[PDB]
Design a binder for this molecule. Structure first.
Ligand SMILES: *[C@@H]1O[C@H](CO)[C@@H](O[C@@H]2O[C@H](CO)[C@@H](O[C@@H]3O[C@H](CO[C@H]4O[C@H](CO)[C@@H](O)[C@H](O[C@H]5O[C@H](CO)[C@@H](O)[C@H](O)[C@@H]5O[C@H]5O[C@H](CO)[C@@H](O)[C@H](O)[C@@H]5O)[C@@H]4O)[C@@H](O)[C@H](O[C@H]4O[C@H](CO)[C@@H](O)[C@H](O)[C@@H]4O[C@H]4O[C@H](CO)[C@@H](O)[C@H](O)[C@@H]4O)[C@@H]3O)[C@H](O)[C@H]2NC(C)=O)[C@H](O)[C@H]1NC(C)=O
Ligand code: Y9S
Ligand code: CA
Ligand code: CL
Ligand code: NA
Ligand code: NA
Ligand code: ZN
Length: 806
């Protein structure tokens, strides 16, 4: 109930929300059907429109007008945005040459440069180039300020998940807005685009920027706007708030536009109808900047021009229907569209079985346009699993397609030509970023980055301490003129042991064998030197990784590779090796096919054993440093040490062996040498974070050998590829992956073919950031380079996407 009987007089677009049943006058009261009776009359004036004309200049103030052109308007803060242009012979902001803003030029009483976030729904990255002719204001922001060629959204690439990620620095699995439609089984409650449940506070986790600001003494404008408030009124409201007395005036503001998304859905990303929405958004930007110029704020405010996601061509006829695959289609609930999420229709049906649903949806049609996944098997770069609102069964839908449950859902519920929501690496889903103002750099292009990083920067722009979030604070310091954030590397928690030769061969009863008893002061001194670390500078190029948790581990040195061997997990946490452009690939010799050798530095008690692998009929093993890339026949023996062995399902070994035998050398050829760091990952609870020893759900049968959920590799070379990886003077280049350690290759529909036809495709899908591997391992890489730490943080957040050019 609302007592809509109170009045909005002197309360229009008030910032503090009044509690029910008292009527409201804030920019969202319309959404709640609670505005006072005179809100429209007083707060949403439209008379005479939005632009001054020559005949209005110097008028007698008529308080009924939407905006003013009277002599008094500048001091009142309510002139039409083109007032000084029409009435005082000034130029539009867009017509002024740009001039570097080296310091804030703010009016007296401004404690800090305000921040205005100008968010555009559905603004695909390629619009910046493709629509530049019809967007002069935006083009001025972009060319004069700091811009990226694109910014990567979060999955799913829908509006609320992305705007809330921009606001919090968090992945959707952590902030809780995991979709446009959600069911939360704990609350037994449903979230929909339409209606009222979405306003309930329990949906919205983390700490958004407006709360971070308010808690730390910084006043915020109200971020959300009711759809019926015209964009011109949103802009005039921000400009009026900026004219408030110092003690009342917010320092941070948001504008939101439902275009170009609204038209994009109807017309497709490049429909001829799309030119008009782009023109109109550019005109809104011009009103804002002209309005700032009038207020002498255009060289004081930092402006961010940012999108939530892009837009793809999608039509009704490109829908896959689960009723073409499932016999039981009425026993499931599907969240449909550009992703799919499946659960049981009834928690009382004891015949529902996820395994049979997954199988019925796996590789059933030759050009099948979705792929099913248990959520823990989704690419780790999506960070899309650790939330009870994410159903266990997920469908990743191909770009340009939809999935639905039955045909009747699609013609009884073609209209549309555009949609979005797909995997966040897809080029059509990318969006935009430009920052313009005293705190941003001048005419500077920065490489693409993820939207999870912007919360930290917006906190930096406002002098706020960010709440804990998923950005890597400092990784975007290269966007900023000042207010950079200069973190320290984390402290190493566990220091390594450096064991020498401590055990005799006969102490080992591991069930292993090796034909290695084919046996000199020249060469014998030389091999001892290798075991002491004499080649470590060649194979450990960026220093050893730091271990950021308490554990017991040993550094093991070899001719061709160095490793950090865990006594707790009985395998390396990491193995590091460099392959030059000229390296030679060799075979595993016949006499070494089944060779596994005890490592006389490491106790039998802290070693794997071969008997467990013989007994485990599902499990085989592979090696982290590949025998194929040994530097000599003698060095090759080191690769068969029990301390280089890891558990691998036979299906996964097809993948791993191809990577090791073929792809490492191919990368070394292409990149002028590579350094590789590989290792296991254990994430049985799919939270994106390193498991402790008591979270491991699967062991090699009979043993205490834990089974990795994933294997990673980080592949680093010189950005300037005219320099070899091991003698690089400048910036680095990296690509990495996190491959799921699965007992089948069901994920790859062409896996019956030669690995050259499917393995690299698999690896591209599971591309990763170094930072993703850090979270999953508790290791910290690149500790010893000649590079700035902020540069290294940017390197660690890089994702190699394998998409063609934007
Ligand atoms: C991305 O960045 C974020 C932010 O930094 C990282 O998320 C953090 O990760 C931590 C580890 O997972 C997690 O720490 C836990 O906090 C618990 C207290 O939680 C409440 O308070 C915080 C602080 O204000 C608040 O933010 C939380 O908000 C969550 O929960 C509500 C819903 O319940 C949501 O509205 C909101 O969206 C958010 O949900 C997300 O996080 C939770 C986990 O907290 C998930 O379950 C959801 O799916 C969703 O992802 C909370 O309101 C605290 O209770 C935990 O402590 C237990 O475990 C530790 C292990 O160290 C142990 O020491 C403790 O003793 C304790 O154990 C006891 O509880 C166990 C579980 O019941 C039980 O098994 C034991 O037997 C014990 O009794 C834990 O410290 C932190 O909350 C989140 N923060 C956020 C905002 O998500 C995230 O990891 C980053 N991601 C990556 C990939 O790096
Ligand atoms: N395109 S879609 O996914 O189908 C879709 C979903 C939801 C809808 C839909 O009805 N909405 C009603 C709109 C009103 N909103 C609003 O005023 O947002 C202000 C805002 C908030 C946070 C921001 O980020 C920051 F904090 F700055 F970092 C920036 C701006 C956004 C809502 C989406 C429309 N389309
Ligand atoms: Ca984990
Ligand atoms: Cl959704
Ligand atoms: Na076996
Ligand atoms: Na297959
Ligand atoms: Zn949309």
């Amino acid at each position: 109930w609302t007592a809509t009987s109170g009045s909005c007089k002197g309360r229009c677009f008030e910032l503090q929300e009044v509690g029910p049943p008292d009527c409201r006058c804030d920019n969202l009261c319309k959404s709640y059907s609670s505005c006072c009776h005179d809100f429209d009359e007083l707060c949403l004036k439209t008379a005479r429109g939005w632009e001054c004309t020559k005949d209005r200049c110097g008028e007698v103030r008529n308080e009924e007008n939407a905006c003013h052109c009277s002599e008094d308007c500048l001091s009142r803060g309510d002139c039409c945005t083109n007032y000084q242009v029409v009435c005082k012979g000034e130029s539009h902001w867009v017509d002024d040459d740009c001039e570097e803003i080296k310091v804030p030029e703010c009016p007296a009483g401004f404690v800090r440069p305000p921040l205005i976030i100008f968010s555009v729904d559905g603004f695909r990255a390629s619009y910046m180039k493709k629509g530049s002719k019809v967007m002069p204001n935006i083009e001025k922001l972009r060319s004069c300020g700091t811009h990226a060629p694109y910014m990567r959204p979060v999955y799913p690439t829908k509006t609320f998940p992305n705007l809330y990620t921009l606001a919090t620095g968090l992945y959707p699995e952590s902030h809780g807005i995991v979709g446009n439609s959600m069911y939360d089984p704990v609350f037994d409650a449903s979230f929909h685009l339409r209606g009222r449940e979405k306003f309930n506070h329990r949906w919205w986790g983390g700490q958004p920027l407006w709360i971070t600001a308010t808690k730390q003494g910084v006043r915020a404008g109200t971020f959300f706007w009711s759809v019926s408030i015209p964009h011109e009124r949103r802009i005039l409201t921000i400009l009026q708030w900026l004219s408030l007395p110092d003690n009342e005036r917010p320092s941070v503001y948001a504008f939101y536009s439902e275009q170009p998304d609204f038209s994009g859905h109807k017309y497709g990303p490049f429909g001829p109808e799309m030119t008009n929405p782009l023109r109109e958004i550019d005109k809104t930007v011009g009103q804002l900047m002209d309005g700032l110029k009038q207020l002498r704020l255009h060289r004081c405010v930092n402006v961010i021009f940012v999108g939530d996601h892009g837009m793809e061509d999608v039509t009704c006829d490109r829908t896959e229907f689960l009723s073409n695959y499932l016999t039981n289609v009425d026993d499931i609930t599907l969240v449909p569209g550009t992703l799919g999420r499946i659960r049981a229709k009834s928690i009382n049906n004891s015949k529902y079985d996820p395994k049979t649903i997954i199988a019925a949806l796996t590789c059933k049609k030759p050009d099948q346009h979705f792929k099913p996944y248990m959520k823990q098997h989704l690419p780790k770069r999506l960070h899309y699993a650790n939330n009870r609102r994410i159903e266990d069964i997920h469908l990743l839908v191909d770009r340009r397609w939809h999935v639905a449950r039955k045909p009747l859902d699609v013609y009884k519920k073609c209209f549309f030509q555009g949609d979005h929501g797909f995997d966040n690496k897809v080029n059509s889903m990318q969006t935009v970023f430009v920052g313009y103002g005293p705190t941003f750099k001048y005419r500077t292009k920065v490489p693409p980055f993820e939207n999870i990083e912007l919360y930290n920067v917006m906190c930096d722009l406002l002098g706020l301490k960010p709440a804990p979030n998923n950005g890597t604070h400092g990784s975007l310091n290269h966007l900023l003129r000042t207010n950079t954030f200069r973190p320290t590397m984390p402290d190493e928690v566990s220091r390594p042991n450096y064991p020498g030769i401590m055990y005799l061969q006969s102490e080992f009863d591991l069930g292993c064998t090796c034909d290695d008893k084919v046996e000199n002061k020249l060469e014998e001194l030389n091999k001892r030197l290798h075991t002491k670390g004499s080649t470590k500078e060649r194979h450990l190029l960026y220093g050893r990784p730091a271990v950021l948790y308490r554990t017991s581990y040993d550094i093991l040195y070899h001719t061709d590779f160095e490793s950090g061997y865990s006594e707790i997990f009985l395998m390396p946490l990491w193995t590091s090796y460099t392959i030059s452009k000229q390296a030679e690939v060799s075979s595993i010799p016949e006499h070494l096919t089944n060779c596994v050798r005890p490592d006389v530095r490491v106790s039998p008690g802290f070693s794997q054993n071969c008997l467990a692998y013989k007994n485990d009929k599902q499990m085989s093993y592979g090696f982290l440093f590949p025998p194929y890339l040994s530097s000599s026949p003698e060095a090759k023996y080191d690769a068969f040490l029990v301390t280089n062995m890891v558990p691998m399902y036979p299906a996964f070994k097809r993948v791993w062996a191809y990577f090791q035998r073929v792809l490492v050398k191919k990368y070394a050829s292409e990149r002028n040498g590579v350094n590789v760091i590989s290792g296991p990952i254990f994430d049985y609870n799919y939270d994106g974070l390193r498991d402790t020893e008591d979270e491991i759900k699967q062991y090699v049968e009979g043993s205490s050998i834990p089974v990795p959920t994933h294997y990673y590799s980080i592949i680093t070379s010189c950005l300037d590829f005219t320099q070899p990886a091991d003698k690089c003077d400048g910036p680095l280049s990296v690509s990495s992956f996190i491959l799921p350690h699965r007992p089948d290759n069901d994920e790859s529909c062409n896996s019956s073919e030669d690995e050259s036809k499917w393995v690299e495709e698999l690896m591209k899908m599971h591309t990763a950031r170094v930072r993703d591997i850090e979270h999953l391992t508790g290791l910290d890489f690149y500790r010893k380079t000649s590079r700035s730490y902020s540069e290294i943080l940017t390197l660690k957040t890089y994702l190699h996407t394998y998409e063609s050019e934007i």
